[PDB]
DNA sequence: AAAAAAAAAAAAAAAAAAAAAAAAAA
DNA sequence: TTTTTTTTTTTTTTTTTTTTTTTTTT
């Protein structure tokens, strides 16, 4: 206790006499995530060694039981700039410039030491509940008690505080405060991987204000903790390793649900209104479409008005109208119909590139799975589901097979897909 | 009482719900039926700057006026349980604009009592969004500033505009 | 202990300034007493009222804000001194056997606008715990109905004198207690033998339901997600899956969360559950006016074709097919027959046809329009996922079944697309539902036959991309000839090119595609997210389409016809006509074309409002189907 | 019904006050509206025309007083509506007109040079006309008793006595007032701020 | 005037105009004492300026002291009130009341950004102690503005010691709240 | 006589998806 | 003759929970 106050102090004389030019750009960050309800900051570390690399060495090494000493600085500095207090525990989210570490040069040597890495999201569960501060109560003597908990890895005392039994205390769930908690799946870059192997994939776990924040099939950048947890594979002494996320970077501005409001700050939308004015705006686009690729004008015009699309209209009386356009390219070998497809993956925001031959009709609309655990079915996306918003673009169309190919039939103009399988009766949204 | 003012040009254009208290022959182009003469007790929705007018003139007018569907009980109620979280934008783009008209040609005081309260509430998240500077080294403003009525973006623009210049000066180096 | 006294005394005053309560309270009293003396009987309604939050927000503020933030602190105060005034109304006395053990406390049940508290089982989060919440959803899956004990009575042998015990669970109460074992005491104080006497003890009903989010407004890209609710005592079998519900609960944590003495893991939560308070449905009663408009709008000679063209104002054309609709939606009158026999009274429409005749935007109509209908799609369905399905329960162990596409939709319409490309081992259960409309299940030791009633709409199309008239009707359609027979009419349409029709065809699609949704400005996407505001109080002419419902409901349960002999002279002449012709008609007539006469006679009768069929129906029945088979329009 | 046509006009001019409102720098006037406001021209001849109808039917005495007071009082209504959406539009354009006019230092702006912020054919023969005796307006103002203040000047505080400007165009040698000042492009000046407000105004100059 | 609203509410740089329109004390590094070319200003009095003797205090306007230190002529003296005692004396009487307003002076933001700016080497204390009790300053002041933003109505506001900056950033918002109530309640009647 | 520790108790199974054979036909 | 069609064949268990009732062990 003697050293954590001494650093809670270092924290704290850092976040309040740090100054670039004229401006305390930390002491004014906190001050306006206060007003919009943001109980969060973000600190780059450049600025940290800038300051003071014994402060910076100190976290580099003992990342687990630092970080909360940092973490309850920022609530002390905000309950002395805010208030002269339902202010919970505030967050710390890190910015990186270090180098980037492969997902499989990930091994022994890097256990409890931050890391930085990029990767595909394949999968996102659902949020769970965490506890921070409990009310406990024991079944004999009955008198109150309190626990605090920070998620930084805890059980209730196997004793009793002033015969009661071995260790009686149950919670009292009300007057007890949660907070969110999220798994996510990651994956391998496909070009990144060695000769010879199947991508790999790795485990994740973000809080609070870093959940709901990436959808399958983005690739992000990850900056966490490469931990190990004990659980559970007939080796001894053997632990899984996994990922505490503390810090993510998204190429897509969509959020987890794409709240469809501007994520553009006025200074791009000026060059986006400049950009829309110019009277040859459309040779402009145009010529950007494969520029590698000669000729084929038409075809090019074509793929920009796919991937700006039309309208969607409703009806009163219920009606639904397709505000999507579908294209088809039929003709001899050797003519760039391939070097086309890769290149609408590449631009649009949201795509996904499939091969008729190695598809089905399973894997292209949705799939029904049954929990190992539960045992129960529940439905599972597919390429169509994936790719929602986006452009599914299916190479080898000829060669798919007759009962693969007739699926897509509702989804291609009444923009659903229908499952009446195993007790399960549902339709989908997809609209590609 | 702006002649020339656009936004009262635009709001004063709604169209309220009322019924004919006369049986008159020639019109019928309110209907959209050209040929066809209107009845007595007929229930349409016509333009504030003819209804307006329309119910002044007669004794008893030759139209009167229906309770309007964005004056009914429940959104009263909304606005009295939780007035940051309503959505105005939904219920009419020009809400406060026809608030003070209504109150104008009927003299509620209730509404009075509750309209005040309402902008008085919302004021200050206006504010809070209004002086949050963003610094180079949220989903809040952008789900707010969709839920704002037409006069309340005139003013979230100059406090915004004003809070912008004022640190603009403060940090110039 | 002084807060709840003065909290049970602030609910007390709010009873008695607001009068309503409390004559619903002795309304219900004197039902349930005067309903018991009634020894000639001809059941009980249960001890729970519904106050509006609204007027508790003008009474108390404070009061207000704490059963919608702390409502486990608020609302047992409450319950309380609902019970000491309902206790004080009933100055009848009841001395009855065993009803002095069991009280029934009574309940609250709430409504008005809920703000900020009106979610959806997605934008559910640890924030929401220990608070008052509405949430809007689906039913998918339903729990078996179990008894559960909450009180035990316990006769002592040399003394004479019974003992109680009580239990508590943490679903039972909104405050957590010592847990119970749930054993019954044996022993007494001074060692006597104690015999459990049942029908002095309490047990309560329980069960589980999950409610899903509804799937047209999950973000892109993402699948829906789904909550648990656990209903008890009197809410009990409220809900079937399937049903669009809205309850009102209070969202509550449980278990231990993996804080114990187990390991140590990041992949271990709390569980989450919600005690629902009150459900509502998301039937349409009628007044006086309504009824008084319809029968007026009855007696019109010419309202057959304004219903018929009331559907689907946005389709060009196909007015018998839109005929044929209605007669579905007003079905024929059942007859149940001796040797356990039932003839139907559904209509099961067939259409065939070229691609983009809009085919599947009426049976998109028909999902929305219809009181029930269930959606499917050939290649996306199986037997087992049509009939029925056997599953598991958890809660209690035991092994269930779960209704599948046919049999959820009772009394309904199921609406099947790509018909056709549906494969042969899917297409024989269908087969029986249209036959003996009954389901038998024969697996796992579960020998059940289950009733489905349901009314068929299919759209398919020919063995190749387009209708051949240089062949014969059975090689153009790939349908055997047994399912073909099950279906009363029938429709073959074809898309011919002919200026005209493609000149006022384009600009009827040109008009309906410049159409503006009012408040919405040129040029404006149109936001179909509603930004979380859910509800705002939680509870040549044509018709509009709420109407039409009502006309529907109000035929389909107020008139049922009888056939007449001068009918049965129309429709048999109309039968020998058709049967001894050499015309060359797109399906074979049988002695089943009959029946097809009489139930379409049937529908058109209802729609006319009568209790007789009349020689009009016959003769609007002949030409629905002379159009159907010949095309001779 | 009648006047629901000129309400899009109004829309109009709403969306032409935001370019101004959001205006870093001056903008352009959109195209002229005339043929939307021929049609409301057309609208209230016809709407005149009905009056007169109503007057001459009214006079022979075949139609009762309340009845005709009532189309009356409609067509009344709705050319006023009109009226007020075209002035309302008008006088919107003629401020963003008055407000150039200000801020190019007076002159003839059209005829002679101009800063190429409008183009001739975006505005009308009336506003082209209106704009010319503003000008002379604005220049006859310059000459009064307020000579010495230069009225069409800076309207930013001066606070910097001496400042670094660097020429943006090229040009010659050009005198003033006690020296000589030589445009060489690319080329940076450490002068008096007095000197160089013109040059900074009309563009040959960069920074303050 | 017109242009980029200016309507109705002053821009910064005629507020630090304002503040510039005020007299300072400095501390000549030259004599210009009559002998036993003039200066003749027309809007402010020149008689300190005429009579100017090295090593001497006098006071004159402060756009004419930052001119003579743009030279190497002088040399300001800040105001007593730029101090770290008396910047602590202030924070905590600020500290201590909690429902009115320190008694600075109506230019103590301008006139610390702009000695801060030009005279960098005349103060006693070090710099950036004195920046960082600013912004101490500044902060509890904000947050007294902002819980005494919820007192808004129809008749009357009382500020009685805020700043001229502080007034010109909030006056839009302040003045368009109260004249729509007022409007509100005016219809009312 | 009174503590701390350690196991029993599982059960269950249909319903769907993918891949390779051994019989049918334009 | 090379195409389509067709049956069909393992796929399943590795996990769970807090009582309740037993043996050891100070
Ligand atoms: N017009 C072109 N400009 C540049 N490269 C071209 C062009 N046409 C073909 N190529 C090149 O030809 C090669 C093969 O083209 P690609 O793979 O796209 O063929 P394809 O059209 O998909 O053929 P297939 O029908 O056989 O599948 C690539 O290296 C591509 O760059
Ligand atoms: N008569 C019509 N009136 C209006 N729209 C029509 C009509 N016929 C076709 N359409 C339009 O054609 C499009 C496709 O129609 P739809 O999906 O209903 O065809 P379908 O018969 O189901 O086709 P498929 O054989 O390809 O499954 C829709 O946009 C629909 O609005
Ligand atoms: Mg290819
Ligand atoms: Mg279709
Ligand atoms: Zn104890």
Same mark, same amino acid.
């Given at each position: 206790?003697?050293?954590?106050?001494?650093?809670?102090?270092?924290?704290?004389?850092?976040?309040?006499?740090?100054?670039?030019?004229?401006?305390?750009?930390?002491?004014?960050?906190?001050?306006?995530?206060?007003?919009?309800?943001?109980?969060?900051?973000?600190?780059?570390?450049?600025?940290?060694?800038?300051?003071?690399?014994?402060?910076?060495?100190?976290?580099?090494?003992?990342?687990?039981?630092?970080?909360?000493?940092?973490?309850?600085?920022?609530?002390?500095?905000?309950?002395?700039?805010?208030?002269?207090?339902?202010?919970?525990?505030?967050? #710390?989210?890190?910015?990186?410039?270090?180098?980037?570490?492969? #997902?499989?040069? #990930?091994?022994?040597?890097?256990?409890?030491?931050?890391?930085?890495?990029?990767?595909?999201?394949?999968?996102?569960?659902?949020?769970?509940?965490?506890?921070?501060?409990?009310?406990?109560?024991?079944?004999?003597?009955?008198?109150?008690?309190?626990?605090?908990?920070?998620?930084?890895?805890?059980?209730?005392?196997?004793?009793?505080?002033?015969?009661?039994?071995?260790?009686?205390?149950?919670?009292?769930?009300?007057?007890?405060?949660?907070?969110?908690?999220?798994?996510?799946?990651?994956?391998?870059?496909?070009?990144?991987?060695?000769?010879?192997?199947?991508?790999?994939?790795?485990?994740?776990?973000?809080?609070?204000?870093?959940?709901?924040?990436?959808?399958?099939?983005?690739?992000?950048?990850?900056?966490?903790?490469?931990?190990?947890?004990?659980?559970?594979?007939?080796?001894?002494?053997?632990?899984?390793?996994?990922?505490?996320?503390?810090?993510?970077?998204?190429?897509?501005?969509?959020?987890?649900?794409?709240?469809?409001?501007?994520?553009?700050?006025?200074?791009?939308?000026?060059?986006?209104?400049?950009?829309?004015?110019?009277?040859?705006?459309?040779?402009?686009?145009?010529?950007?479409?494969?520029?590698?690729?000669?000729?084929?004008?038409?075809?090019?015009?074509?793929?920009?008005?796919? #991937?700006?699309?039309?309208?969607?209209?409703?009806?009163?009386?219920?009606?639904?109208?397709?505000?999507?356009?579908?294209?088809?390219?039929?003709?001899?070998?050797?003519?760039?119909?391939?070097?086309?497809?890769?290149?609408?993956?590449?631009?649009?925001?949201?795509?996904?590139?499939?091969?008729?031959?190695?598809?089905?009709?399973?894997?292209?609309?949705?799939?029904?799975?049954?929990?190992?655990?539960?045992?129960?079915?529940?439905?599972?996306?597919?390429?169509?589901?994936?790719?929602?918003?986006?452009?599914?673009?299916?190479?080898?169309?000829?060669?798919?097979?007759?009962?693969?190919?007739?699926?897509?039939?509702?989804?291609?103009?009444?923009?659903?897909?229908?499952?009446?399988?195993?007790?399960?009766?549902?339709?989908?949204?997809?609209?590609? | 009482?702006?002649? =020339?003012?656009?936004?009262?040009?635009?709001?004063?254009?709604?169209?309220?719900?009322?019924?004919?208290? =006369?049986?008159?022959?020639?019109?019928?182009?309110?209907?959209?039926?050209?040929?066809?003469?209107?009845?007595?007790?007929?229930?349409?929705?016509?333009?504030?700057?003819?209804?307006?007018?329309?119910?002044?003139?007669?004794?008893?007018?030759?139209?009167?006026?229906?309770?309007?569907?964005?004056?009914?009980?429940?959104?009263?109620?909304?606005?009295?349980?939780?007035?940051?979280?309503?959505?105005?934008?939904?219920?009419?783009?020009?809400?406060?604009?026809?608030?003070?008209?209504?109150?104008?040609?009927?003299?509620?005081?209730?509404?009075?009592?509750?309209?005040?309260?309402?902008?008085?509430?919302?004021?200050?998240?206006?504010?809070?969004?209004?002086?949050?500077?963003?610094?180079?080294?949220?989903?809040?403003?952008?789900?707010?500033?969709?839920?704002?009525?037409?006069?309340?973006?005139?003013? =979230?623009?100059?406090?915004?505009?004003?809070?912008?210049?004022?640190?603009?000066?403060?940090?110039?180096? | 202990?002084?807060?709840?006294?003065?909290?049970?005394?602030?609910?007390?005053?709010?009873?008695?300034?607001?009068?309503?309560?409390?004559?619903?309270?002795?309304?219900?009293?004197?039902?349930?007493?005067?309903?018991?003396?009634?020894?000639?009987?001809?059941?009980?309604?249960?001890?729970?009222?519904?106050?509006?939050?609204?007027?508790?927000?003008?009474?108390?503020?404070?009061?207000?804000?704490?059963?919608?933030?702390?409502?486990?602190?608020?609302?047992?105060?409450?319950?309380?001194?609902?019970?000491?005034?309902?206790?004080?109304?009933?100055?009848?006395?009841?001395?009855?056997?065993?009803?002095?053990?069991?009280?029934?406390?009574?309940?609250?049940?709430?409504?008005?606008?809920?703000?900020?508290?009106?979610?959806?089982?997605?934008?559910?989060?640890?924030?929401?715990?220990?608070? +008052?919440?509405?949430?809007?959803?689906?039913?998918?899956?339903?729990?078996?109905?179990?008894?559960?004990?909450?009180?035990?009575?316990?006769?002592?042998?040399?003394?004479?004198?019974?003992?109680?015990?009580?239990?508590?669970?943490?679903?039972?109460?909104?405050?957590?207690?010592?847990?119970?074992?749930?054993?019954?005491?044996?022993?007494?104080?001074?060692?006597?033998?104690?015999?459990?006497?049942?029908?002095?003890?309490?047990?309560?009903?329980?069960?589980?339901?999950?409610?899903?989010?509804?799937?047209?407004?999950?973000?892109?890209?993402?699948?829906?997600?789904?909550?648990?609710?656990?209903?008890?005592?009197?809410?009990?079998?409220?809900?079937?899956?399937?049903?669009?519900?809205?309850?009102?609960?209070?969202?509550?944590?449980?278990?231990?969360?993996?804080?114990?003495?187990?390991?140590?893991?990041?992949?271990?939560?709390?569980?989450?559950?919600?005690?629902?308070?009150?459900?509502?449905?998301?039937?349409?009663?009628?007044?006086?006016?309504?009824?008084?408009?319809?029968?007026?709008?009855?007696?019109?000679?010419?309202?057959?074709?304004?219903?018929?063209?009331? +559907?689907?104002?946005?389709?060009?054309?196909?007015?018998?097919?839109?005929?044929?609709?209605?007669?579905?939606?007003?079905?024929?009158?059942?007859?149940?027959?001796?040797?356990?026999?039932?003839?139907?009274?559904?209509?099961?429409?067939?259409?065939?046809?070229?691609?983009?005749?809009?085919?599947?935007?009426? +049976?998109?109509?028909?999902?929305?329009?219809?009181?029930?209908?269930?959606?499917?799609?050939?290649?996306?369905?199986?037997?087992?996922?049509?009939?029925?399905?056997?599953?598991?329960?958890?809660?209690?162990?035991?092994?269930?079944?779960?209704?599948?596409?046919?049999?959820?939709?009772?009394?309904?319409?199921?609406?099947?697309?790509?018909?056709?490309?549906?494969?042969?081992?899917?297409?024989?259960?269908?087969?029986?539902?249209?036959?003996?409309?009954?389901?038998?299940?024969?697996?796992?030791?579960?020998?059940?036959?289950?009733?489905?009633?349901?009314?068929?709409?299919?759209?398919?199309?020919?063995?190749?991309?387009?209708?051949?008239?240089?062949?014969?009707?059975?090689?153009?359609?790939?349908?055997?000839?047994?399912?073909?027979?099950?279906?009363?009419?029938?429709?073959?349409?074809?898309?011919?090119?002919?200026?005209?029709?493609?000149?006022?065809?384009?600009?009827?699609?040109?008009?309906?595609?410049?159409?503006?949704?009012?408040?919405?400005?040129?040029?404006?996407?149109?936001?179909?997210?509603?930004?979380?505001?859910?509800?705002?109080?939680?509870?040549?002419?044509?018709?509009?389409?709420?109407?039409?419902?009502?006309?529907?409901?109000?035929?389909?349960?107020?008139?049922?016809?009888?056939?007449?002999?001068?009918?049965?002279?129309?429709?048999?002449?109309?039968?020998?006509?058709?049967?001894?012709?050499?015309?060359?008609?797109?399906?074979?007539?049988?002695?089943?074309?009959?029946?097809?006469?009489?139930?379409?006679?049937?529908?058109?009768?209802?729609?006319?409002?009568?209790?007789?069929?009349?020689?009009?129906?016959?003769?609007?029945?002949?030409?629905?189907?002379?159009?159907?088979?010949?095309?001779?329009? | 019904?009648?006047?629901?046509?000129?309400?899009?006009?109004?829309?109009?001019?709403?969306?032409?006050?935001?370019?101004?409102?959001?205006?870093?720098?001056?903008?352009?006037?959109?195209?002229?509206?005339?043929?939307?406001?021929?049609?409301?021209?057309?609208?209230?001849?016809?709407?005149?025309?009905?009056?007169?109808?109503?007057?001459?039917?009214?006079?022979?005495?075949?139609?009762?007083?309340?009845?005709?007071? !009532?189309?009356?009082?409609?067509?009344?209504? !709705?050319?006023?509506?009109?009226?007020? !959406?075209?002035?309302?539009?008008?006088?919107?354009?003629?401020?963003?007109?008055?407000?150039?006019?200000?801020?190019?230092?007076?002159?003839?702006?059209?005829?002679?040079?101009?800063?190429?912020?409008?183009?001739?054919?975006?505005?009308?023969?009336?506003?082209?006309?209106?704009?010319?005796?503003? !000008?002379?307006?604005?220049?006859?103002?310059?000459?009064?008793?307020?000579?010495?203040?230069?009225?069409?000047?800076?309207?930013?505080?001066?606070?910097?006595?001496?400042?670094?400007?660097?020429?943006?165009?090229?040009?010659?040698?050009?005198?003033?007032?006690?020296?000589?000042?030589?445009?060489?492009?690319?080329?940076?000046?450490?002068?008096?701020?007095?000197?160089?407000?013109?040059?900074?105004?009309?563009?040959?100059?960069?920074?303050? | 005037?017109?242009?980029?609203?200016?309507?109705?509410?002053?821009?910064?740089?005629?507020?630090?105009?304002?503040?510039?329109?005020?007299?300072?004390?400095?501390?000549?590094?030259?004599?210009?004492?009559?002998?036993?070319?003039?200066?003749?200003?027309?809007?402010?009095?020149?008689?300190?300026?005429?009579?100017?003797?090295?090593?001497?205090?006098?006071?004159?306007?402060?756009?004419?002291?930052?001119?003579?230190?743009?030279?190497?002529?002088?040399?300001?003296?800040?105001?007593?009130?730029?101090?770290?005692?008396?910047?602590?004396?202030?924070?905590?009487?600020?500290?201590?009341?909690?429902?009115?307003?320190?008694?600075?002076?109506?230019?103590?933001?301008?006139?610390?950004?702009?000695?801060?700016?030009?005279?960098?080497?005349?103060?006693?204390?070090?710099?950036?102690?004195?920046?960082?009790?600013?912004?101490?300053?500044?902060?509890?002041?904000?947050?007294?503005?902002?819980?005494?933003?919820?007192?808004?109505?129809?008749?009357?506001?009382?500020?009685?010691?805020?700043?001229?900056?502080?007034?010109?950033?909030?006056?839009?918002?302040?003045?368009?709240?109260?004249?729509?109530?007022?409007?509100?309640?005016?219809?009312?009647?």
């Amino acid at each position: 206790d003697d050293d954590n106050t001494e650093i809670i102090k270092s924290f704290k004389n850092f976040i309040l006499e740090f100054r670039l030019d004229s401006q305390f750009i930390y002491r004014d960050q906190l001050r306006n995530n206060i007003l919009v309800k943001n109980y969060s900051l973000t600190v780059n570390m450049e600025h940290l060694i800038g300051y003071n690399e014994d402060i910076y060495k100190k976290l580099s090494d003992e990342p687990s039981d630092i970080i909360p000493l940092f973490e309850t600085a920022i609530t002390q500095v905000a309950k002395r700039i805010s208030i002269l207090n339902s202010l919970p525990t505030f967050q #710390l989210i890190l910015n990186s410039n270090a180098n980037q570490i492969p #997902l499989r040069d #990930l091994d022994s040597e890097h256990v409890s030491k931050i890391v930085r890495l990029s990767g595909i999201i394949i999968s996102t569960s659902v949020l769970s509940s965490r506890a921070t501060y409990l009310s406990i109560m024991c079944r004999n003597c009955r008198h109150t008690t309190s626990i605090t908990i920070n998620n930084f890895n805890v059980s209730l005392p196997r004793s009793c505080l002033s015969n009661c039994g071995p260790d009686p205390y149950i919670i009292i769930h009300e007057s007890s405060k949660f907070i969110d908690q999220q798994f996510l799946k990651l994956q391998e870059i496909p070009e990144l991987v060695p000769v010879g192997e199947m991508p790999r994939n790795l485990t994740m776990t973000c809080d609070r204000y870093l959940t709901n924040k990436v959808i399958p099939g983005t690739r992000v950048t990850i900056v966490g903790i490469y931990s190990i947890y004990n659980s559970k594979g007939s080796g001894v002494a053997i632990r899984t390793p996994y990922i505490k996320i503390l810090g993510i970077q998204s190429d897509v501005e969509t959020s987890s649900i794409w709240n469809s409001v501007t994520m553009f700050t006025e200074e791009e939308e000026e060059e986006f209104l400049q950009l829309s004015r110019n009277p040859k705006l459309y040779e402009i686009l145009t010529n950007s479409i494969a520029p590698s690729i000669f000729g084929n004008e038409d075809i090019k015009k074509a793929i920009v008005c796919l #991937l700006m699309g039309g309208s969607k209209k409703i009806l009163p009386d219920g009606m639904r109208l397709r505000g999507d356009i579908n294209v088809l390219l039929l003709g001899d070998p050797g003519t760039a119909k391939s070097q086309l497809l890769k290149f609408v993956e590449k631009v649009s925001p949201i795509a996904v590139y499939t091969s008729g031959k190695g598809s089905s009709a399973a894997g292209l609309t949705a799939s029904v799975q049954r929990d190992p655990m539960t045992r129960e079915f529940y439905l599972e996306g597919g390429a169509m589901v994936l790719a929602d918003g986006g452009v599914v673009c299916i190479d080898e169309f000829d060669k798919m097979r007759d009962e693969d190919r007739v699926a897509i039939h509702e989804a291609m103009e009444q923009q659903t897909i229908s499952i009446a399988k195993a007790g399960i009766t549902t339709v989908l949204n997809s609209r590609t | 009482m702006g002649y =020339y003012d656009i936004d009262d040009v635009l709001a004063d254009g709604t169209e309220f719900p009322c019924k004919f208290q =006369y049986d008159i022959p020639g019109l019928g182009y309110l209907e959209n039926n050209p040929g066809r003469p209107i009845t007595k007790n007929t229930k349409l929705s016509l333009p504030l700057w003819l209804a307006r007018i329309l119910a002044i003139v007669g004794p008893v007018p030759f139209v009167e006026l229906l309770p309007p569907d964005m004056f009914s009980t429940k959104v009263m109620n909304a606005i009295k349980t939780d007035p940051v979280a309503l959505d105005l934008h939904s219920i009419n783009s020009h809400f406060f604009s026809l608030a003070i008209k209504w109150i104008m040609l009927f003299s509620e005081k209730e509404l009075a009592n509750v309209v005040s309260e309402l902008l008085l509430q919302r004021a200050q998240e206006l504010n809070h969004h209004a002086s949050s500077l963003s610094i180079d080294l949220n989903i809040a403003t952008s789900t707010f500033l969709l839920k704002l009525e037409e006069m309340e973006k005139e003013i =979230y623009k100059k406090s915004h505009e004003s809070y912008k210049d004022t640190k603009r000066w403060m940090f110039k180096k | 202990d002084a807060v709840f006294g003065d909290r049970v005394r602030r609910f007390q005053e709010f009873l008695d300034t607001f009068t309503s309560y409390r004559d619903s309270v002795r309304s219900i009293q004197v039902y349930n007493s005067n309903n018991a003396a009634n020894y000639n009987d001809d059941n009980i309604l249960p001890h729970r009222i519904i106050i509006s939050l609204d007027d508790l927000r003008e009474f108390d503020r404070s009061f207000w804000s704490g059963i919608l933030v702390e409502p486990a602190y608020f609302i047992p105060p409450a319950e309380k001194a609902l019970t000491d005034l309902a206790d004080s109304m009933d100055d009848v006395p009841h001395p009855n056997a065993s009803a002095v053990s069991s009280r029934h406390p009574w309940k609250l049940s709430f409504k008005g606008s809920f703000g900020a508290h009106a979610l959806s089982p997605r934008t559910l989060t640890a924030q929401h715990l220990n608070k +008052l919440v509405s949430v809007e959803g689906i039913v998918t899956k339903t729990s078996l109905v179990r008894p559960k004990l909450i009180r035990s009575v316990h006769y002592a042998a040399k003394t004479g004198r019974f003992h109680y015990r009580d239990y508590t669970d943490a679903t039972t109460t909104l405050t957590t207690r010592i847990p119970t074992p749930a054993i019954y005491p044996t022993e007494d104080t001074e060692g006597n033998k104690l015999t459990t006497e049942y029908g002095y003890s309490t047990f309560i009903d329980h069960q589980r339901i999950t409610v899903q989010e509804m799937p047209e407004m999950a973000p892109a890209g993402q699948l829906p997600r789904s909550i648990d609710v656990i209903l008890d005592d009197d809410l009990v079998d409220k809900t079937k899956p399937g049903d669009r519900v809205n309850v009102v609960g209070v969202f509550k944590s449980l278990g231990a969360g993996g804080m114990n003495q187990s390991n140590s893991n990041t992949l271990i939560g709390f569980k989450t559950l919600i005690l629902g308070n009150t459900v509502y449905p998301l039937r349409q009663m009628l007044t006086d006016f309504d009824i008084r408009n319809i029968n007026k709008l009855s007696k019109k000679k010419d309202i057959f074709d304004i219903l018929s063209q009331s +559907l689907a104002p946005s389709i060009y054309g196909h007015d018998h097919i839109k005929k044929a609709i209605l007669l579905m939606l007003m079905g024929g009158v059942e007859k149940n027959l001796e040797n356990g026999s039932h003839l139907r009274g559904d209509i099961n429409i067939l259409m065939v046809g070229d691609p983009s005749t809009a085919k599947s935007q009426l +049976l998109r109509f028909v999902l929305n329009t219809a009181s029930l209908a269930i959606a499917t799609t050939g290649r996306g369905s199986s037997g087992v996922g049509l009939t029925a399905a056997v599953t598991t329960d958890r809660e209690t162990g035991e092994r269930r079944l779960e209704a599948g596409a046919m049999v959820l939709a009772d009394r309904g319409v199921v609406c099947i697309d790509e018909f056709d490309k549906m494969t042969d081992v899917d297409r024989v259960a269908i087969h029986e539902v249209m036959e003996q409309q009954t389901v038998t299940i024969a697996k796992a030791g579960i020998h059940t036959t289950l009733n489905a009633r349901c009314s068929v709409i299919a759209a398919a199309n020919p063995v190749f991309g387009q209708y051949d008239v240089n062949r014969d009707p059975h090689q153009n359609i790939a349908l055997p000839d047994s399912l073909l027979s099950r279906f009363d009419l029938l429709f073959v349409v074809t898309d011919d090119i002919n200026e005209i029709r493609d000149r006022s065809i384009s600009e009827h699609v040109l008009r309906t595609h410049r159409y503006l949704p009012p408040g919405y400005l040129e040029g404006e996407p149109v936001r179909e997210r509603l930004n979380l505001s859910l509800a705002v109080g939680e509870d040549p002419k044509l018709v509009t389409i709420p109407f039409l419902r009502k006309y529907v409901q109000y035929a389909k349960e107020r008139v049922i016809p009888q056939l007449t002999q001068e009918a049965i002279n129309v429709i048999v002449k109309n039968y020998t006509d058709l049967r001894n012709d050499d015309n060359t008609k797109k399906s074979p007539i049988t002695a089943r074309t009959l029946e097809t006469l009489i139930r379409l006679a049937t529908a058109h009768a209802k729609v006319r409002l009568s209790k007789t069929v009349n020689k009009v129906d016959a003769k609007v029945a002949a030409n629905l189907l002379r159009f159907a088979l010949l095309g001779e329009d | 019904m009648y006047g629901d046509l000129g309400n899009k006009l109004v829309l109009e001019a709403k969306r032409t006050k935001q370019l101004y409102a959001r205006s870093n720098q001056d903008v352009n006037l959109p195209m002229y509206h005339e043929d939307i406001i021929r049609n409301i021209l057309k609208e209230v001849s016809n709407l005149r025309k009905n009056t007169e109808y109503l007057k001459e039917q009214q006079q022979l005495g075949m139609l009762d007083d309340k009845v005709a007071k !009532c189309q009356y009082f409609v067509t009344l209504l !709705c050319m006023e509506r009109n009226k007020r !959406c075209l002035l309302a539009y008008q006088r919107l354009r003629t401020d963003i007109l008055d407000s150039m006019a200000w801020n190019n230092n007076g002159l003839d702006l059209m005829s002679s040079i101009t800063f190429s912020q409008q183009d001739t054919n975006n505005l009308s023969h009336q506003e082209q006309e209106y704009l010319k005796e503003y !000008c002379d307006l604005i220049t006859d103002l310059k000459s009064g008793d307020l000579v010495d203040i230069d009225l069409s000047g800076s309207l930013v505080p001066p606070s910097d006595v001496f400042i670094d400007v660097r020429v943006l165009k090229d040009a010659g040698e050009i005198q003033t007032e006690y020296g000589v000042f030589n445009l060489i492009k690319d080329s940076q000046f450490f002068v008096r701020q007095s000197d160089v407000e013109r040059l900074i105004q009309q563009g040959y100059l960069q920074k303050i | 005037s017109l242009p980029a609203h200016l309507q109705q509410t002053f821009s910064p740089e005629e507020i630090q105009f304002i503040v510039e329109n005020e007299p300072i004390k400095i501390f000549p590094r030259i004599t210009t004492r009559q002998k036993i070319t003039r200066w003749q200003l027309i809007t402010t009095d020149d008689k300190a300026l005429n009579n100017m003797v090295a090593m001497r205090s006098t006071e004159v306007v402060l756009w004419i002291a930052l001119l003579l230190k743009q030279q190497s002529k002088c040399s300001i003296v800040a105001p007593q009130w730029l101090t770290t005692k008396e910047l602590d004396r202030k924070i905590q009487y600020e500290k201590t009341h909690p429902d009115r307003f320190s008694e600075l002076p109506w230019n103590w933001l301008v006139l610390a950004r702009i000695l801060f700016n030009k005279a960098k080497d005349d103060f006693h204390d070090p710099i950036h102690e004195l920046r960082g009790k600013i912004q101490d300053l500044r902060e509890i002041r904000q947050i007294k503005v902002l819980k005494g933003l919820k007192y808004l109505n129809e008749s009357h506001l009382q500020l009685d010691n805020l700043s001229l900056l502080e007034i010109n950033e909030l006056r839009p918002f302040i003045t368009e709240i109260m004249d729509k109530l007022r409007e509100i309640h005016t219809a009312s009647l």
